[PDB]
Structures are given as C-alpha cells and as structure tokens.
Amino acid sequence: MEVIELNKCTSGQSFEVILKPPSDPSLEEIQKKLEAAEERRKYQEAELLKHLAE
Amino acid sequence: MRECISIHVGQAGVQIGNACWELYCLEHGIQPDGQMPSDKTIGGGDDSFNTFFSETGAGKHVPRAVFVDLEPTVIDEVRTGTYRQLFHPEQLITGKEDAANNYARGHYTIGKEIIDLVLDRIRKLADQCTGLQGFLVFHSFGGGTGSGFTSLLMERLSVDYGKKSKLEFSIYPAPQVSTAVVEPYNSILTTHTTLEHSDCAFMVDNEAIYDICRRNLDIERPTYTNLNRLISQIVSSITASLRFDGALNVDLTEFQTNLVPYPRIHFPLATYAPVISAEKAYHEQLSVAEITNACFEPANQMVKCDPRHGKYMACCLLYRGDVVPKDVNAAIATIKTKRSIQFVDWCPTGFKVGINYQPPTVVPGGDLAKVQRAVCMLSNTTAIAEAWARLDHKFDLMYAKRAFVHWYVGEGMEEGEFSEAREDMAALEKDYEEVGVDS
Amino acid sequence: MREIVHIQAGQCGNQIGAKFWEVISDEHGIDPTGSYHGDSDLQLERINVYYNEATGNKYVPRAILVDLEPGTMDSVRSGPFGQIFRPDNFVFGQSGAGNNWAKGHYTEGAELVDSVLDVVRKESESCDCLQGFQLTHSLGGGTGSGMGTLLISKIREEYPDRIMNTFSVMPSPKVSDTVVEPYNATLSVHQLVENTDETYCIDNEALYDICFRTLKLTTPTYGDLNHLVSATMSGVTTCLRFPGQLNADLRKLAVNMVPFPRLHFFMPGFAPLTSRGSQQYRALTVPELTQQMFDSKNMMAACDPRHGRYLTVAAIFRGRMSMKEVDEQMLNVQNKNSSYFVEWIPNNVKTAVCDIPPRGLKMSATFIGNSTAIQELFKRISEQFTAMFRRKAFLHWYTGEGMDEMEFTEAESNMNDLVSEYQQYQDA
Amino acid sequence: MYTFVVRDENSSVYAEVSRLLLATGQWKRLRKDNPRFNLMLGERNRLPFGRLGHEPGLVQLVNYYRGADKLCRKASLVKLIKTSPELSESCTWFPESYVIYPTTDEREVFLAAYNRGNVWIAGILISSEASELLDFIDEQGQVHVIQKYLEKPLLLEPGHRKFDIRSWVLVDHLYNIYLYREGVLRTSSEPYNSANFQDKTCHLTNHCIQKEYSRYEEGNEMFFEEFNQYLMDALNTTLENSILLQIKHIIRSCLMCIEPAISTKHLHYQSFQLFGFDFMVDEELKVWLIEVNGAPACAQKLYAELCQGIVDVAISSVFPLATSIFIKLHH
Ligand SMILES: CC[C@]1(O)C[C@@H]2CN(CCc3c([nH]c4ccccc34)[C@@](C(=O)OC)(c3cc4c(cc3OC)N(C)[C@H]3[C@@](O)(C(=O)OC)[C@H](OC(C)=O)[C@]5(CC)C=CCN6CC[C@]43[C@@H]65)C2)C1
Ligand SMILES: Nc1nc2c(ncn2[C@@H]2O[C@H](COP(=O)(O)OP(=O)(O)OP(=O)(O)O)[C@@H](O)[C@H]2O)c(=O)[nH]1
Ligand SMILES: Nc1nc2c(ncn2[C@@H]2O[C@H](COP(=O)(O)OP(=O)(O)O)[C@@H](O)[C@H]2O)c(=O)[nH]1
Ligand SMILES: [Ca+2]
Numbered sequence A: 001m002e003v004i005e006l007n008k009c010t011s012g013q014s015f016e017v018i019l020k021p022p023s024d025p026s027l028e029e030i031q032k033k034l035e036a037a038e039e040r041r042k043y044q045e046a047e048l049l050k051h052l053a054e
Numbered sequence B: 001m002r003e004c005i006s007i008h009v010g011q012a013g014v015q016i017g018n019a020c021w022e023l024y025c026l027e028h029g030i031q032p033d034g035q036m037p038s039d040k041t042i043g044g045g046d047d048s049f050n051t052f053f054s055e056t057g058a059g060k061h062v063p064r065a066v067f068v069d070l071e072p073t074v075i076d077e078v079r080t081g082t083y084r085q086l087f088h089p090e091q092l093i094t095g096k097e098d099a100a101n102n103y104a105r106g107h108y109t110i111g112k113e114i115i116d117l118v119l120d121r122i123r124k125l126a127d128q129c130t131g132l133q134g135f136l137v138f139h140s141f142g143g144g145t146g147s148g149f150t151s152l153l154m155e156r157l158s159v160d161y162g163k164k165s166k167l168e169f170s171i172y173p174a175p176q177v178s179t180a181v182v183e184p185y186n187s188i189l190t191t192h193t194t195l196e197h198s199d200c201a202f203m204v205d206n207e208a209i210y211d212i213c214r215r216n217l218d219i220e221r222p223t224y225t226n227l228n229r230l231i232s233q234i235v236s237s238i239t240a241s242l243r244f245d246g247a248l249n250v251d252l253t254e255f256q257t258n259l260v261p262y263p264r265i266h267f268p269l270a271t272y273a274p275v276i277s278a279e280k281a282y283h284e285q286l287s288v289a290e291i292t293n294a295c296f297e298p299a300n301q302m303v304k305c306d307p308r309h310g311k312y313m314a315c316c317l318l319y320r321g322d323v324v325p326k327d328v329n330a331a332i333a334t335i336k337t338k339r340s341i342q343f344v345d346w347c348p349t350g351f352k353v354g355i356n357y358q359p360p361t362v363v364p365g366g367d368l369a370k371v372q373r374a375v376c377m378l379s380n381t382t383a384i385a386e387a388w389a390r391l392d393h394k395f396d397l398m399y400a401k402r403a404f405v406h407w408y409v410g411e412g413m414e415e416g417e418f419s420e421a422r423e424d425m426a427a428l429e430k431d432y433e434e435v436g437v438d439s
Numbered sequence C: 001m002r003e004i005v006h007i008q009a010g011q012c013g014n015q016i017g018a019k020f021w022e023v024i025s026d027e028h029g030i031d032p033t034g035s036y037h038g039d040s041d042l043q044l045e046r047i048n049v050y051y052n053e054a055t056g057n058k059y060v061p062r063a064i065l066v067d068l069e070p071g072t073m074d075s076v077r078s079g080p081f082g083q084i085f086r087p088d089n090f091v092f093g094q095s096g097a098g099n100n101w102a103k104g105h106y107t108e109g110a111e112l113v114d115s116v117l118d119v120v121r122k123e124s125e126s127c128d129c130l131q132g133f134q135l136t137h138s139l140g141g142g143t144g145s146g147m148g149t150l151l152i153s154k155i156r157e158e159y160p161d162r163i164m165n166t167f168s169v170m171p172s173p174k175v176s177d178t179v180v181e182p183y184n185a186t187l188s189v190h191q192l193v194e195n196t197d198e199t200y201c202i203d204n205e206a207l208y209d210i211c212f213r214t215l216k217l218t219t220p221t222y223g224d225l226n227h228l229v230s231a232t233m234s235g236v237t238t239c240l241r242f243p244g245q246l247n248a249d250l251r252k253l254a255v256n257m258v259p260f261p262r263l264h265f266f267m268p269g270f271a272p273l274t275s276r277g278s279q280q281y282r283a284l285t286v287p288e289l290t291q292q293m294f295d296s297k298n299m300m301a302a303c304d305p306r307h308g309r310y311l312t313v314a315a316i317f318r319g320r321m322s323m324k325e326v327d328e329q330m331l332n333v334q335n336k337n338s339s340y341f342v343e344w345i346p347n348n349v350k351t352a353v354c355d356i357p358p359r360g361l362k363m364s365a366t367f368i369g370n371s372t373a374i375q376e377l378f379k380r381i382s383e384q385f386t387a388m389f390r391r392k393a394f395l396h397w398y399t400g401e402g403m404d405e406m407e408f409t410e411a412e413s414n415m416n417d418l419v420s421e422y423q424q425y426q427d428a
Numbered sequence D: 001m002y003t004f005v006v007r008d009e010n011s012s013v014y015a016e017v018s019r020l021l022l023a024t025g026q027w028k029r030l031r032k033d034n035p036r037f038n039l040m041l042g043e044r045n046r047l048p049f050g051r052l053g054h055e056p057g058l059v060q061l062v063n064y065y066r067g068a069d070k071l072c073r074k075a076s077l078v079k080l081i082k083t084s085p086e087l088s089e090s091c092t093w094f095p096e097s098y099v100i101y102p103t104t105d106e107r108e109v110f111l112a113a114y115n116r117g118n119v120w121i122a123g124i125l126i127s128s129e130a131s132e133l134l135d136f137i138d139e140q141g142q143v144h145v146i147q148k149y150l151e152k153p154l155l156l157e158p159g160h161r162k163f164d165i166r167s168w169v170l171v172d173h174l175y176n177i178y179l180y181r182e183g184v185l186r187t188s189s190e191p192y193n194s195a196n197f198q199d200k201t202c203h204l205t206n207h208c209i210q211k212e213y214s215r216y217e218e219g220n221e222m223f224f225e226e227f228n229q230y231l232m233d234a235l236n237t238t239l240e241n242s243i244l245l246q247i248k249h250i251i252r253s254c255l256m257c258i259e260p261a262i263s264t265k266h267l268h269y270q271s272f273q274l275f276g277f278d279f280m281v282d283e284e285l286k287v288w289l290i291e292v293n294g295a296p297a298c299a300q301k302l303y304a305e306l307c308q309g310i311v312d313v314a315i316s317s318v319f320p321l322a323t324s325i326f327i328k329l330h331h
C-alpha cells in the first residue's frame, strides 16, 4: 500500500512497505558454579576409589 | 565499517562454517589462497566486506573467525582442506576427547580445560577490530560440544563483551540424521542457559533441510555436505547485508531492532526460495511473485510449522538478483489477500525489504541450480514455538523416568539444572502462547 | 588417536580373543607378521584404535594375553596370527584355576594380577587419548571369570574415568557339564553389574541353538560357536574401527545404549547366520537383513525379545547397499512393532552403515539390543544357582579358598535385584 | 497394517469408527501416547497439532482441522461472518447477531439497531426487553452472544410444533466437502407459544431438553423420508427444492470461507473433520444457520452408515485396504 524510506545504491535497494497500522552473571559467579560442579565430580570419584579400597 | 567475528563450535558448527566461508569467498572473489584481485587497496580497507575479512600486507584476506571443537578430527579437515591457506593456525582450536554427546561434559568437565584458551584467541581477533559489532555463533543443539561449550562461551562473552551483539545459527535435532537419543536433553539445557545471552538466533531443523533436499534436489539420502551447502545459502542470504553495500540490516543491532521486539522471543523463522535441482534440464525461471509466495509455504521453511496459527511480530524479505521494488510491492498485495497473515495488534502489518542485485552464488558442482532471482524471508512468528513443544515433549518422556540422567550427574551437574531448564522452556512456551491468541 | 586396550583372560577368553584379532586383522589388511597389504586407505584410518605402530611400519595389536595356565597361550602362539602379539604381553602362570572363581579371584589370581597390571600400564601410558578397555572371558570357568573380574576391579581403580567393556560368555548345560558353572557365573555377574559400562552377553545356550538347530551342525565344536562370536565381535566394533558418524567411540556408545547404570547388558544379533565353509551364494536383500537381525533366532543371547521391550538399539549394516532402503527398512521395523520399543525413550534406535563388508559376505547386519528380555538369561542362571546353593552343595570348593557363604548370598541377591529392575522398566 | 491412537474416549462416533477399523484386520490400536501412528482420533481440546507430521516413514492423518474452531464457537462464527468479505454483512442466511462481554466487542451497537418485531435470544434465555438479559450475561462468566430469535418458524402439523435440522458434513484431506444424504429434524413434542417467551419448553429444540421437560415421531426425531413426505402433502414442495439447496449453499459458503486458513493441502500432516450444521426453516420456507458443531453426536439409527462412510471417504482414501451415501458439494 504505502512505500517508505527507499534507499538505492549500485548494489541494490532497501525499503519498508506498510499495509496497515496497529490496533546477567559475573565472571565470579560463573567460576562458583563451575567449581561447585567439579567439586561434586571429585566427591563422586572419591566415594568410588574408597569403595574399591574396601 | 564495523567488524563481526564468527565462532564455529563443535562438528555441526565447524562443517557449516566451512560451507559458509567457502561461499563467502566465491561471492567476494577471494581465491582459496586468500588473494582478492578485485581489492585495490592492499593490506587494508574499510569496505563492507572487511567486516568479515581482515587483510595482510601480502594481500591475504583472512576470515575473522575462530573454530572450536573438543576433538580434532573435523577441524583437522579444515587444517588440510582446500582453504587451508585462508586461516591461520591460531584460529583453529581442538582438544583430545569430545563431550560424548553429553552437555554436562561439554559445559563443565571438558569445557573448563579449554574456555580460557578460546577466549584468548577471540581476544586476539577482537583487538584487530576498529569497531567490533559482536559475534555470529554456529553450533548444534544436540552435540555435547555444540550445546555445552557454546553456552559456556556465550556466558563468558557477555562478561568480556557486555555491549556487543551475539547472533546464533543453531542446528535443531532431527532423528533422520541425529546421533544421540539424548539430544532433546542437550537442546533444552543449552537453550535455557544461552537464552539471556543471545540477541537473535536463527534455528534450522535438520528435518526441514533434509526434506527440501530430498524433494527439491532429488537427493535420496542427503549427506551433511548436501545439508550444509543449502544451509550456507540461507546463512549467506541473512549475512549478505553485513558484507555488501546496502541500508537494511547493516549492523548486528539492526537484526534485533527489525526482528525482535521481545528479548526472549528472539527466534525468527527463515523461509528460502527457490531451491532447484542442478541436474534438472532447465527449470522455467520463477518470478518475483512466485518466489515471494513460496515464502509462505511450510515446505520451504527452515522449520516445519504453521504460521497461519500464530501471529507475526516482524517480517523481512531479502532478495538476491533480478528484482525491483515495483514487482515486490505487487507480489505482496496479491499475497496479503490470498493468505491469512496476522500481525499482533501492537504491530504494523508490514515488510522491511532488501534487494541485492547479485543473484545467488552457487558452489560449482553443487546440487543447486543457478537462478536469476531468489529470496529469504525472516519472519518472527509465534508459530516457531511448535518446535519448542516437540522438543519439550520428548524431554518430558525421558526425564520422567530419569533416563540417561546419571551421565550428566556423573559429570558434576545436578538434577536440579534439568527441571530448572525445563521450567524456563515451559515459561517460554507460555510467552509465545500469550503473544499469539486472537483465537 | 583414542586407543583401546584389549585384554583376554582364561581359556575361552583367549580363544575368542585370538579369533577376534584374526578376523579384524584381515579386515584392516594386516597379515600374520604385522604388515599392511590392503587396498583402501579406509582400512588404515582408525587402525590405531586397536593397533600400535612401530618403526618397520609394523602394526602390533594393543592386546594383553592372560591365563593361569600355559596351555591356551601356547595354542595362540602357534596359531595363525600367533606372531603379531607383543611377546611381553603374554602373561601367564602354571597353577590353573580349576574352574573355580575363588582361585581366579582371590588366591591363584591374586598372585598373577600385578604383572598383568604392569603390562596394562605400559600399554596405557603409551596412548594419546585412551578410550578404555575391552575384555573377553567366559563366566563359567575360573580364570576368565574370577581373575577376569579381579582385573576389571583393579583396572577401574587405576583408571576410574575410562570406559570398561566386556564380551562375556555365559555358561549353558547344553554345551558343558561342570556342575559349579552357575556359581562362577553369578559371582561374576555381580562384579559386571558394578564394574563395567557395557557388557555383550554371549550366551553359549544361544550359540548352541544356532549351530545345532539352524546351521544343522550335529557335532558342534567350540570352533563352530566361535565362528559366530567372532562375526558378532567384528560387527559390534565396526563403528570403532572405521570412519563413521554414530557410536564412533566407547563412551558415545555407552551414552546411547545405557539409560540406567546397571542395565548395560546387551543382546547381540547377527545376519546372515553361516557355518564356516558354508559358501555364500545369494547375498541377502536389505529387507532380509533387517527381518533377520531382529529375529529371536539370530540373537546371541537365549532370550525371546517378544517377551520384553527394547530400551535402546544399535543397528550396523555392512556392504554396498542403498542407504535409502536401509532407512526405509529400519523405520518399517519400528513402525510395525512399535510396542516392543519403550515409548518413553524417543528415537531409541540408531543406524550405521559401513561400505566395507566382512570376509566372505557381500551384505551383513549386526544388532545390539538393550532389551528387558535379557532378564531371562539372568533368571536361568539364578535358578541353577539356587537349586544348589539352598543345600550349600559344592560350596567347600570355595570356602576352602577362604570365601564365606555370605558373599554367595550377596551375589545371588544382587543378580535377583538386577532381574527385577529390568522387570520394572518392562512394564512402566 | 495401519496404526492408530484414541485420545477421545467420550466420542460416540469415533468409538464406532475405531470398532470398524479393528474389525478390518489391517488396523491396530496403540497406546494413547505412542507416536508411531498413522491415524490420530484426537482429544476435543488442545490437540497437539504441533507434534503431528514429524514421524519419518509415517503418513499421518488426524480427525480434526486446526483452526475450524473459528466456525464452531458462537462468538467466533458471528465475528467470522461479520468480518469475512466472502460472507459479508450482506449475508442473507444468518440471523442478526452481536457479541457481548460480561462487565474489543460490540455491546453498544446491539441496542443501537434495537430501538428501530424486537425479540432476541441469548443455559439460555429469551426476551424482548433488552435491559434484563444484559444482566443475565453479566452474572455469568462466559462471553455470551445474542441474535434475533426467529419470530415465525415453520411449524409441523399435526401439532403446531417447531424443529431444527441437523446435517452431517465430512471434509476430507483434499478438502472435498461431503454432505451425508441423511439429516434429522429434532422436533418439539409440545405446541408453539408465541406469547410469553421465557419458558424453555417449546422454543428450545435440542434433544436432551425434551427427554425432560416434555409422541408423534419416535424420540422427537423425524428423518428425511418422513419430512419430505410432509412437505409434499401440506406445502406441495420437496425437501430438496425448498430446503436442501439452501442448506447445501450455506455449507459450501462457510467451509470455503475458511479453506485458506485451515486447508492441510501443502502441510506435513493431513486433517479431515466431521461437522454438525444446525439450521432453522421459517414460514416462507427460508433456511437459517444457527450453529456449527465441531464434535457432533449422530442419530442412533444412522451411526452404522455414517461411521462406515467416514472410514470409506476420510480414512481409507489415505490408507487403502484390500452408490455413495454422501453428496459431493462441488467448488
Ligand atoms: C560346542 C562345544 C561342545 O562341543 C558342545 C557339545 C559338548 N562339548 C564336548 C564334546 C561332546 C558332545 N557329546 C559328547 C559325548 C562324549 C564326549 C564328548 C562329547 C556334544 C556332541 O557333539 O554330541 C554329538 C554334545 C554334548 C551335549 C549336548 C549336545 C551335544 O551335541 C549335539 N547336549 C544337548 C547335552 C546333553 O546333556 C543333552 O542332550 O541335554 C539334554 C547330552 O545329554 C544327552 C541325553 O544327549 C550330553 C551328551 C554327552 C550328556 C551329558 C551332559 N552333556 C552336556 C552337553 C550335552 C552332554 C557337543 C563341547
Ligand atoms: N546440518 C548439519 N547437522 C549436523 C552436522 N554435524 C552434526 N550435525 C547434527 O548435530 C547434532 C550432533 O552434534 P555435533 O555437532 O555433531 O556434536 P558436537 O558439537 O561435536 O559435540 P560432541 O561430539 O559430543 O563433543 C546431531 O543432531 C547431528 O545431526 C552437520 O555438519 N550439518
Ligand atoms: N564360546 C566358547 N566358550 C568356551 C570356549 N572355551 C570354554 N568355553 C566355555 O567357558 C566356560 C569354561 O571356562 P574356561 O574359559 O574354559 O575356564 P577358565 O580358563 O578358567 O577361564 C564353559 O562355559 C565353556 O563352555 C570357547 O572357545 N568358546
Ligand atoms: Ca582492501
């Protein structure tokens, strides 16, 4: 219906065509999560080596 | 002029990246050894294409890109490929063992041993920028590395580059070419963790690309090479405005402005036409009206869904080749009567349009026929939520029995990150629902 | 290079071990002296997964040979591929284990285990990126069984973050008549439940049925049985040894096949079924391959799949054939018998194709199933066990080696727990 | 062997249809949330269409059309007829109607054409004085709609009694529109009172409400045989000429109106659906559309034939096995 903001150049053209109107964590906190997960991973292995020791 | 850095993560991201970078070279006339005869300013520039390529005093145009994978096999191909001279060794990063299709292993366990290296390589490219706009990030949802490392990286990038834009190209899992029963797990985990850090993500369902390849290209059993050449065409269409002279979508920020009113709803549907077999003994060349109308066929979407049963919040048409505004405007009013195209009330029913006269470049010996004109539509429709519904239902089926959960917990993840991630997706489904309910 | 270390223990372990190495050496174009003589570079691409490379461009199997008696060790040495193995990797005793788990696991075995571990350590410290281990052994005897599971516990202790995989031959009174085998098997299953990531259940009961009923071998030998074992072992390791997208390493396979830690005992299957020397005339169609590989008669574990449900399946097709037709025929099986795959693990069937066929065959297919029907195997052993144990029969052979009967009560309990746990998921 | 699932156990029609499928020996029923089905007989509400058509190696078909609700809710139908140019405010065959919310609608323009024969309808109630009914809705919590009640209905004799006509229509995956040659008149058993309206007895025709507050024909159901005979003897016309042509027209119009919005022609799954249209015939043998039901029940005598026709035309055309009872409405 209505054409707007027609930009031309040697490469091509752009425009907008309207048919109708309307009607975050820190580097510190990230370390804390990674270290903790790695803590559980280490605890889990410890338990295992321990069971294998019995 | 403002630079963008591309980051290719895991196997999917890397192989797609090679497709795109190969296609970029053919479009700008950059040879495999990095020489670009057309470029008359040697050793430097602020031309539009310099947004993706830096230059050396020897005339080498090298991509502003980093490739990252926890296993070396795939990137090794790049290291020895036909474009081996294009990249310098520092931007190709690999590990020894991969994430074994395990998000927890990609994020926590194996990720932590390589994140600071990757960021240091990324820092190096960034420092070579006079005006970095942000990042384009390529990865799969389903792989351990594509899902786990990526969400690690994305978070760190927000910390070290708080003001830069981050765009995503995301491969969404399809059984026909998928490699782990656990991909819905990985998909929901990474989506949950990456969501606040991504400004705009283009999702590609391998299922959709597989079938376009089967049906339109006559490929009986599509390979990754087939899928990826098609994907790079779409990616190229989307990034063309960054690499060429123009006035639409000229910077990363404008993608969000034009396509993303709601931050969390940042997943535009891409539709591409036309896709024609090169083995086809000539196809009657399609008109502006015809390729424009094809944009509203589910069968040409990067995600199978039904935009009729949703609403639009924004819509961009990107044309390449023999196109002038009059034929476009005349293709649109026709379509607007033939089809049910409903924008949300607080939105103008309208299209931002961009024409680039260079018709699509195809890879020589590829499956795609050359065409005098093509178009990629980017439409932010609520209908894309159908893919979240699918993904989440598969997650629920397995998670209820805790199937496979021990593999993640054994890597140091807690069960709680599963439920938390699913709850976030439940909220995301409800947001789409709110936005698209006149009926 | 993502290396695998291979260990073979006891008589059965070494005999199927040797035949495995003979079969895959041929597929990779390696000869008895360790020299390459193949066409495809496809054969050499992942050759380092199983083979070490020296100067002289020789390939030496990353394989350790273990036994408590010299017998089968000499047998391997004079065997066709006897000369390829690292001589220092032959580790053996003089006592034997007398078909007695306690001797393998606690007395005779303990005396030999450390020198085995030295050779493991040598092979492992040599690897760029060690995947983990695979062991061949039987569960009915003493050395593969008792010492075999001791090795697994010690190896896990030194390498807790590597994958442990076994090919475990289950005893059957159709093939042997040593009365304590159900004792040795139960003691070993308890171990395997706790200490392996993946176990292929190779059931001498099923090997016997195939040989006698299906292949019409009226005097079957261990040679016949092992013909099936080696074919199956080539099949299930195809994705480790050739370029490929699916289950390409031991951990990715475990993540695709193991939804619950304890439920990691697989039913292998193979098609076509053949006798040695039974020359192949007509290659099967893709359809035939698919129907057969899922047929109860082609399973290497004596369990009726229709009596349970599949949690996970891997299917590997080999030979030149339509990838489209393979996809079509695999979807057909799932779409046609969909009640036999659990609904709460979507797309739980995965399919691989490798262009290189196996020796003598133009077309083959290997099935790996995680079926709740494997409970029948463990139930079978369990009844045999309890028939004796409730009267403490033959126990003195074990108590004489220092074991208490409480340790028998526990193995029996653990195995019955395992069975009921399969039963949980069969219903669900 | 074709597979299907059942997700609506309450439906009597698709109860029979599943019965008919299993009896063929080429269908088998799965557990409700088994995904590997060819056919879904879906739930009445919140059917997960988004999950259909993503099963490799399965052609999938479902017994509902996504978006057809816009024709099968009263509010939605008024809205669809007033704002759809194919149907237009120039729509001779739908009674004047307004959507009203209990305090984006038109509660206002309702009274505007009022104060210009004023009798209207709104758990229901009729009246001529607007002010009161607008409180009836206000009390209730659902969006109610109001239309002119039909002052002068066609009244059957003997009895001086009013009725409504229910027609069954099947739309298949190709969007062929099929009218079942058998419809039914749901009759009032007791005579028609023009005076005081607010008595829900001889004005409401629906079945259950007449097995309660209420001889001539069995179950107050008169079939096409009978009613056609009556029209010939008392009015000297046929059912076909004086009525069915108007009914065939309205059906065509409604379902062609929404075709662009719900057609599954180029979709990754296919739909069919059974609708129950309800009409009124007035004194001048003029036909009126009352409502479109998306989950209709069938008359007892007819289940066997209709449900059989569903398997023949809707299901087996997509899934072949080893005169016609429908009238194809062409377009
Ligand atoms: C594959 C390994 C194998 O060769 C398999 C069988 C057994 N052995 C050793 C070789 C052997 C066999 N038979 C022998 C007789 C004397 C000496 C040696 C043998 C063998 C065979 O080839 O038969 C022609 C065989 C053996 C058996 C055998 C089958 C068989 O080959 C066909 N069995 C099924 C059992 C057996 O117990 C049985 O039939 O179960 C009801 C069977 O009993 C009867 C009534 O025949 C029998 C026969 C000696 C008796 C007692 C216990 N054992 C346990 C296994 C079983 C056997 C074949 C090892
Ligand atoms: N389109 C396309 N999809 C791919 C490609 N490679 C893998 N995929 C898909 O991505 C998912 C697998 O994840 P990958 O990217 O391969 O895994 P990864 O990121 O390397 O992570 P790990 O291997 O577990 O360490 C599956 O859904 C695949 O089908 C590719 O080259 N192209
Ligand atoms: N399939 C197969 N089974 C064997 C072989 N040798 C022995 N067995 C079985 O293994 C069990 C005997 O254990 P064995 O390996 O001989 O004892 P070990 O030497 O102490 O480990 C019995 O179930 C035998 O039937 C063989 O070569 N092949
Ligand atoms: Ca320049």
Ligand SMILES: [Mg+2]
Residues within 6 Å of the ligand: B010, B011, B069, B071, B074, B098
């Ligand atoms: Mg990879």
Ligand SMILES: [Mg+2]
Residues within 6 Å of the ligand: C011, C141
């Ligand atoms: Mg022996």
